[PDB]
Write a protein that binds this ligand. Structure first.
Ligand SMILES: N=C(N)c1cccc(C[C@@H](NC(=O)N[C@]23C[C@H]4C[C@H](C[C@H](C4)C2)C3)C(=O)NCCc2ccccc2)c1
Ligand SMILES: [Ca+2]
Ligand SMILES: [Ca+2]
Lengths: 51, 234
């Protein structure tokens, strides 16, 4: 599960009632596929700037 | 940073520099949000009055992207011990919010369990700062970064002359001449994960710099995530 390539999560990976559950840091919203983390603004945390 | 690499444009956005009354950098910090800065508690004894500069890569001259912020509140861990440097952590609340832009952006705060099993388990992390380029030399005028391997926990205790508490972790090399140094203290130790950088450590201390048989010691951010959270709420 989360032990397998981070459960295919972009960021945080949890196992609720078994099975992968992905989450994201503040400033990101979980994508519809529930794995990807989508930046909410021009400068999401953890991203080098290429402004 | 001894023998690292110069932070190229937009590469070390989360870096913050604590400057004294003479506008000289004496410690680093990590940008956590527009209002909060993470640094080492021991750095608070390095200067009486200090401010925080962000967006700077070369201190020799202002380019136009750097910005200075005054500190409104300083939140030092009450258990910080000047003796061993245990609980070496502090959070700074700024009077005016940081404006994110080129070279200015926060690092991500990870969750505890995930960070420990997925981040600390990584092969390496990245440390950066304006500190000394050599043990005896002067503070670097350019911002530098260094990829430092995570060091086996027990393999570290063996090499240390001082006790490595659970609020500490080690990164660096045994002989190779690369390591953080004086002046990088309080600075960012971030771990990359799928092109996203998470704060994992704070430059704390070390016996000298880049010494053979010695590693750099960092305060374990995962052991203070709740503490950090509470601090960012007050
Ligand atoms: N190698 C690193 N990664 C690193 C990173 C940040 C800072 C340091 C060194 C810095 N570290 C410490 O002081 N560590 C302690 C650990 C413990 C408790 C305190 C007293 C003793 C015993 C020494 C502080 C230092 O030794 N001296 C301050 C001035 C100095 C700078 C450069 C060379 C010699 C002396 C090293
Ligand atoms: Ca400058
Ligand atoms: Ca060494």
């Amino acid at each position: 599960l989360c032990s397998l390539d981070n459960g295919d999560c972009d960021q945080f990976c949890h196992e609720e009632q078994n099975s992968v559950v992905c989450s994201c840091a503040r400033g990101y919203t979980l994508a519809d596929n529930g794995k990807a983390c989508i930046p909410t603004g021009p400068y999401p945390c953890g991203k080098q700037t290429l402004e | 940073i001894v023998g690292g690499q110069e932070c190229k444009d937009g590469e070390c956005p989360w870096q913050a520099l604590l400057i004294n009354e003479e506008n000289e950098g004496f410690c680093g910090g990590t940008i956590l949000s527009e209002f909060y800065i993470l640094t080492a508690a021991h750095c608070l004894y390095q200067a009486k009055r200090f401010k925080v500069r962000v967006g700077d890569r070369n201190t020799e001259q202002e380019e136009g992207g750097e910005a200075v912020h005054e500190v409104e509140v300083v939140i030092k861990h009450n258990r910080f011990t000047k003796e061993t440097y245990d609980f070496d952590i502090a959070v700074l609340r700024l009077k005016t919010p940081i404006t994110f832009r080129m070279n200015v952006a926060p690092a991500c705060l990870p969750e505890r369990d995930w960070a420990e099993s997925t981040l600390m388990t990584q092969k390496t992390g990245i440390v950066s700062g304006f500190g000394r380029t050599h043990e005896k030399g002067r503070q670097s005028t350019r911002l530098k970064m260094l990829e430092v391997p995570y060091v086996d926990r027990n393999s570290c205790k063996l090499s240390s002359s001082f006790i490595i508490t659970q609020n500490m972790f080690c990164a660096g090399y045994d002989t190779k001449q690369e390591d953080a140094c004086q002046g990088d203290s309080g600075g960012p130790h971030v771990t990359r994960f799928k092109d996203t950088y998470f704060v994992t450590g704070i430059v704390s201390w070390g016996e000298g710099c880049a010494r053979k048989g010695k590693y750099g010691i960092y305060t374990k951010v995962t052991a203070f995530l709740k503490w950090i959270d509470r601090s960012m709420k007050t």
